[PDB]
Symmetry: D2
Subunit: 320 residues, 4 copies
């Protein structure tokens, strides 16, 4: 076939949509930052920190995405896990899109060299007022585009839009993201479950039951396999590729979940839905929750449609 | 205080031991293979497989799955070290006997790309290696690999995760080296590393719960429902041994792969998964048990023999063994 | 100044026009190709050919640029040093642009690891006829965009358009061309002359005097320095950065010059003229020569204005 | 099958019944070459030009210096960057003297032309304490010499008693790969290399030799001219393709420009070990007895029949 790169793809989609080119420039600018995060995560230059010539990853990742999006002339408001407040882009470098991002998700346990990621979500400013944090408090339903970069065994960018979910592998030799999986869809039912079972004594009765139904199948089926990496980008990527269910529900330390709706839960929910999968808080869809805080936390149960539905049936047999 | 590379370290250690060079050349040939596996695992040249020059079919055997390419890289690099007689791998049913002209003294049992079953999900993967000496007089055979893990000369792993790190355990201790992909050199980042006495993380597939033996079932409940009114232990299971055991060494805690049903003598293979990681653990002040015995004290009968494995922080493995000893009989 | 990339620059400049989007894809396809050539010229994977798993550069350069420009859906006619006849692109992948390129200029001496390059010149199909070789026989004054890629100590793409000349360094760590020099303009007069002096016997009288005026200055000033790599991309790039003059004039073996108008002479003349410099054949401007063959050779004297005008004064005296 | 520099230096040291110090020195120096290559190809350039908001000759020196000191194999280190010999601290002192040029050609690195790292290794003459006199040895006493070319691709050329061996860097895995074994030069070439901008300040012998190549007296083809202005590149071309490289003596530079210890001597050893020659006009570069660490020497090196022809013309004018 002829090589389809991210750059050719984002240009072709904008040209067929006869668009301005601001969405294309955002995604190009974001992927140049993802390439730079990947170089830094794989530790290029570590010899210079250890004295080859005689002589931050969280922050650098944020500084890379921030600077690359501000110089895009395509963003107005930027929300980062790292920045406690929204960034309002200077007037002269302003564009029509609001971007909610998590620069290096999983960096908590990056000392063990566990898979880390960049989670992103793009909205349009619908308001007529001056750029403010309020332009970022849109429900996931209004997402123009979303996705994640995985810095695992190789680096991959998953781009979810209305065309579908597209998977691009970084070729470090040329710095190009090669489309390796087009219009990807999730399995209707998987065989893997993912959650921290260390919060067992703190779990909701409904979670406790669903987990025991996978370990000890009532329908005399095969017991599910357990996988929990501790990095949402890695756990959710395996959920898209292999199928199954990722859960981060309420515990006690975190009674509204740990994971953050705007730049963790909402982007992943958009990827899942566009890939024929589901994503709930237990009560509603992640994409239907209207936010009040940029750093608001939210429960997430995402994956293979039938597996999310099975969970929801247990929640129903326990709640309102 | 001053910089060091894997190459310099292994060459200086061999001169300090006034040695032949065979171990030093083996370890350098193994590390050249590890930089090559890293380049391919990070998908360098994938553009050529997707028509950047418009040519796929079967090109330069780059259509090989990364577990075959990894094995072919480790096998050809080790054979050309002039340091190997017998080579055991996860990919080859019978041991490889190295042609007389390239034969050396060491037996290597290795796992070329551990976790490759799920490499579609871009899971952290690794090369696990264990180096033994031929203590036999008979013509090189598979029996030369059937040595217990106490007889090991050196052992360790390459993790292909966020970054690529070689962990090389010897009698000098465990040394951790980071691959700088800019210069193609492993940089000594962590020296004579020691595992924590007690951790706060447990790692096992709890989807095998209905088949878990009572000792595993109790120990797990002790970490979720602690007696001491302590914080419950956290759960991490990547599903790649290299990744889970690396986290056990850096953060502390316990990695368990027990048995019963499906794989009933454990799953993980003793010669090229369990023993390598047990030597790293024991050289870092950690522990590695099958429950009944220490992994390193198991005398192997087959090269693809499996073993049960509970490894990590000394106090954590000892707590498990107390629970096991109550249910042992 | 804020950071810019080649891909960002080309998308911003192409957004300015309503745009078909074809020229932006063409330039981004040429960008991807140049990074591929750069990797292969720096000898990435050579260990595979020498036994790592125990299991061309000029041709591979041509195949990459040909395939990348065919799959841009923006090219109709492709002329290359490598192919004797022009390439007429398949109807389904056809666009409005005619690209004339030298895929790896200097690769005759690439065994000594000499600096090499990719020279490119993009024209618009101006005919209503079926795409043909004749669509490449446009004068250099009709160039829409031109430039080169130098694979030397580092890889740089120099892109010339109406907006002027912009120089972008490839950061191989991230695989991105970083804009390092904006709206570049050449020095008025330099201190370096560039030509193969082994042809002194077959040299035109005027070149003989110009070189004798650089070695033995008439203004009792400092003699010029001589640099000649034998790769045009290297010599013209030095001419642009440090100033001076590059000459490949006529001789006996090459009475109409050696370097090729369409994919060597014209592309480099556009970059020089967009940077406030000059490029002459002696008789006329390189860009004003109407091509008759796609492999037509042309004499070239390019560089710093005062230097090319001093040569032109001696040409008028002879 | 696969021969790397690591396996080469280890095998050659075992064939020499050696300690392992020189092997360590060459592994350490080759780590520094890889790190210079990364910097020279501008990896990270994006961090300088603002991708996240918020020297090459000095870096090259610092890399080579620290890698040679941490090798525990050096006692005296002479660089072009330091006016005084560096006496390695007693706690990492070894038995070898290294004279090196960290980035030869860096004057003109802004034009992205080929650059290099030139090196020469001697053994300490002393049995007492190390001094600059342990570096003031003639090139005959060299144990190992060579150069790293950062051109189209990165190559380390290592010359020893075993001969001259060429290693290509695979940037993908960071290994130097044996690609040309016991290399030897052409008996006669067809390329001459010199800055002809010094034509008025030239010796009558140099004037004649250059005229014999431009205007052949034997009705042979006139020779070609190549002068990159980076010695590493010009001498590598001379080795791979043949011919002559001349940085001769002017009346403005009576002892030449290029430095005996870390430019002329190292390249004279490579030429001699490849069946070529290297003269100052009066004597062999390797036979000259150094009196100053930054001493300049004239250098005419390359294919044997070409340097001999020069010497015949030098004799006529002596
Ligand atoms: C999947 C649909 C899509 C994809 C990409 Cl990549 C796009 N890029 C641009 C652009 O203008 O750059 C647009 C049009 C956006 C607008 O006008 O609503 C666009 C639409
Ligand atoms: C830490 C101990 C060690 C480490 C390395 Cl890296 C070594 N390399 C070699 C070698 O001979 O190459 C030896 C000695 C071998 C022998 O004891 O038989 C050796 C010993
Ligand atoms: C010379 C200034 C320029 C630069 C770039 Cl990068 C351009 N890109 C595009 C484009 O639309 O692709 C155009 C307009 C011509 C078309 O319609 O093809 C364009 C013009
Ligand atoms: C081919 C000549 C050579 C090459 C290498 Cl690579 C060497 N390495 C070592 C060493 O000391 O390891 C020596 C010893 C000879 C000395 O003392 O100069 C040696 C000799
Ligand atoms: O450690 P826990 O409680 O199981 O939660 C891990 C979760 O926290 C996260 O790391 C997010 O937080 P960090 O970016 O600070 O690491 C998720 O990637 C991941 O799902
Ligand atoms: O899926 P399970 O049964 O939990 O087993 C996981 C184990 O299998 C392994 O992947 C080994 O198998 P592969 O090398 O074939 O993938 C271990 O690294 C890992 O601990
Ligand atoms: O060796 P000469 O006669 O000076 O010609 C050199 C010229 O030929 C070229 O090398 C072009 O030919 P190639 O593309 O075949 O190498 C120019 O790059 C250079 O200016
Ligand atoms: O420009 P000139 O006078 O011809 O000198 C060029 C010579 O100087 C050098 O550049 C050495 O000087 P630098 O190391 O300062 O660049 C040689 O590489 C080269 O042979």
């Amino acid at each position: 076939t002829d090589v389809n790169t991210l750059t050719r793809f984002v240009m072709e989609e904008g040209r067929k949509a006869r668009g301005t080119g601001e969405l294309t420039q955002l995604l190009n600018s974001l992927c140049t930052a993802v390439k730079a995060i990947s170089s830094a995560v794989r530790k290029a230059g570590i010899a210079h920190l250890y004295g080859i010539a005689g002589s931050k990853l969280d922050v650098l990742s944020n500084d890379l995405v921030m600077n690359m999006l501000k110089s895009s002339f395509a963003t107005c408001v930027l929300v980062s896990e790292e920045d406690k407040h929204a960034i309002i882009v200077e007037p002269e470098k302003r564009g029509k899109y609001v971007v909610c991002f998590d620069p290096l998700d999983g960096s908590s346990n990056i000392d063990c060299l566990v898979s880390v990621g960049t989670i992103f979500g793009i909205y349009r400013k619908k308001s007529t007022d001056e750029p403010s944090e309020k332009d970022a408090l849109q429900p996931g339903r209004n997402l123009v585009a979303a996705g994640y970069a995985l810095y695992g065994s190789a680096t991959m960018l998953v781009l979810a839009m209305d065309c579908g979910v597209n998977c691009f592998m970084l070729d470090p030799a040329i710095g190009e993201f090669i489309l390796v999986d087009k219009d990807v869809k999730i399995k209707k039912k998987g065989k893997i479950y993912s959650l921290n079972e260390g919060y067992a004594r703190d779990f909701d009765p409904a979670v406790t039951e669903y987990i025991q139904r996978k370990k000890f199948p009532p329908d005399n089926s095969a017991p599910y396999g357990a996988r929990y990496v501790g990095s949402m980008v890695a756990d959710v990527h395996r959920t898209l590729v292999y199928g199954g269910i990722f859960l981060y529900p309420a515990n006690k330390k975190s009674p509204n979940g740990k994971l953050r709706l705007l730049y963790e839960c909402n982007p992943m929910a958009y990827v899942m839905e566009k890939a024929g999968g589901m994503a709930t808080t237990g009560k509603e869809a992640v994409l239907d929750v209207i936010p009040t805080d940029i750093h608001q936390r939210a429960p997430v149960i995402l994956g293979s449609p039938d597996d999310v539905l099975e969970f929801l049936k247990v929640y129903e047999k326990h709640s309102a």
